[PDB]
């Protein structure tokens, strides 16, 4: 019958690894690099679009950085279509929580929820896992500014600075070298762009190959603002930091 054609997506290897999770991680290692850096006064999200064209409409384009709500955003590395399925589910969870408790969802609770959905696809159902790794940048009034990552296994961890996608080994070493705890957003912006500029597989880092975002309490008084950078604004910050 049908058994013949079953790849069995949810089995251990003899070494105790999940084949499909490992292979999904291999896929993600070829995706454009995304970086997150947490500072005392905000969070930075920086990401590289994959080998683009001059005819691509950049100002209406979005493949890396997505808004989950007013307080939480994600950077994507992997299959964009897979990511959008999960992103829409996360957006719904955030609104479910807000409707139930009349408070914005804490960052970790949203992260745990999405990570549990990823986990399920590795243990039951016989379906392929989502080929996506997320960097979560968010704020709530319990822990303040937070960075998380999740991968196809459904495992998630918290970070001061982190990269996903291509060249994460090189990127993480560079971040580990220059990162300090008393760092500010403007410094973190520079670190993120400098790290991408050194790890990129492209010849040079330009505005049309980047997506950029910040989460700042640089919003008038005790509140948080999300800023998805426009193409011209990415071009300006590249000149300011002295990369172009």
């Amino acid at each position: 019958g049908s058994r013949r054609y079953d790849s069995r997506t949810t089995i251990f290897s003899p070494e105790g690894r999940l084949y499909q999770v490992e292979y999904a991680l291999e896929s993600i290692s070829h995706a454009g690099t995304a970086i997150g850096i947490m500072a005392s006064d905000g969070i930075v999200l920086a990401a590289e679009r994959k080998v683009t064209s001059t005819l691509l409409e950049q100002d209406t384009s979005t493949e890396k950085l997505y808004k989950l709500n007013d307080k939480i955003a994600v950077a994507v590395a992997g299959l964009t279509a897979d990511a959008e399925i999960l992103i829409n589910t996360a957006r719904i969870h955030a609104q479910n929580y807000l409707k139930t408790y009349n408070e914005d969802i804490p960052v970790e609770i949203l992260v745990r929820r999405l990570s549990d959905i990823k986990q399920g696809y590795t243990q039951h159902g016989g379906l392929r896992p989502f080929g996506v790794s997320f960097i979560y940048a968010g704020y709530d009034d319990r822990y303040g500014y937070q960075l998380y990552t999740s991968n196809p296994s459904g495992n998630y961890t918290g970070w001061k600075a982190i990269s996903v996608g291509a060249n994460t080994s090189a990127a993480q070493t560079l971040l580990q070298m220059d990162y300090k705890d008393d760092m500010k957003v403007d410094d973190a912006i520079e670190l993120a762009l400098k790290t991408l500029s050194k790890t990129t597989d492209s010849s040079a880092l330009t505005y049309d190959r980047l997506e950029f975002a910040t989460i700042r309490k640089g919003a008038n008084d005790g509140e948080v603002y999300q800023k998805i950078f426009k193409p011209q604004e990415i071009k300006d910050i590249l000149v300011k930091t002295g990369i172009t």
Partner: protein, 195 residues
């Protein structure tokens, strides 16, 4: 399981609930505690149809205790009240609704403020300085409207509460067998054992 009162003073919320339970023409109990602790700084009193009251209250308690363990964090009184309201709004369009009215008295440790929420069985929520359910308000609100200040001490709140109970005991036809009084403040929940 008819009379439940609430008053929010300067630094605490006070809930007063009757002790009587009646089955038919006989009073079965005169020491019944119509309340459940949802979290260390959140107390809920209840009144409505027999059975439904305790079942609903304990169901809410279990859910808040579950949340507390999962997140290692106490939900704000506002968050708890919204959860409770949704459950009742859900319930009113069910096959057999839970005929339960509640008062939620909590102390918000973040804002350092006492808070009193009144929610009826339809899911009608209001935040009030003082509240009641059923006909209880008909006898007591004129006294509360007159004497209440937002800067009252806990002791003054208890005295105003005594006056409300005395008026109930005078003009209500039913013997509700006195009230159990509990105080919710920054230090948690405690019962006034002489009232």
């Amino acid at each position: 399981m008819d009379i439940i009162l609430g008053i929010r003073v300067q630094d605490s919320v006070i809930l007063a609930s009757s002790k009587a339970v009646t089955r038919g023409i006989s009073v079965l109990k005169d020491s019944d505690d119509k309340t459940r602790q949802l979290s260390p700084h959140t107390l809920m009193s209840f009144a409505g149809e027999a059975g439904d009251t305790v079942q609903f209250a304990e169901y809410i308690q279990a859910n808040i205790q579950l949340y507390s363990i999962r997140e290692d964090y106490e939900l704000s009184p506002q968050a708890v009240s919204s959860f409770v309201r949704q459950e009742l709004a859900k319930s009113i369009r069910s096959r057999r609704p839970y005929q339960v009215n509640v008062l939620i008295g909590g102390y918000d440790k973040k804002k350092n403020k006492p808070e009193l929420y009144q929610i009826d069985y339809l899911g009608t929520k209001v935040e009030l300085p003082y509240g009641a359910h059923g006909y209880s308000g008909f006898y007591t609100f004129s006294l509360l409207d007159h004497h209440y200040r937002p800067d009252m001490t806990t002791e003054e709140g208890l005295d105003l509460l005594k006056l409300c109970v005395q008026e109930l005991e005078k003009r209500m036809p039913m013997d509700f067998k006195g009230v159990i009084v509990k105080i919710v403040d920054k230090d948690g929940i405690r019962q006034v054992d002489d009232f």
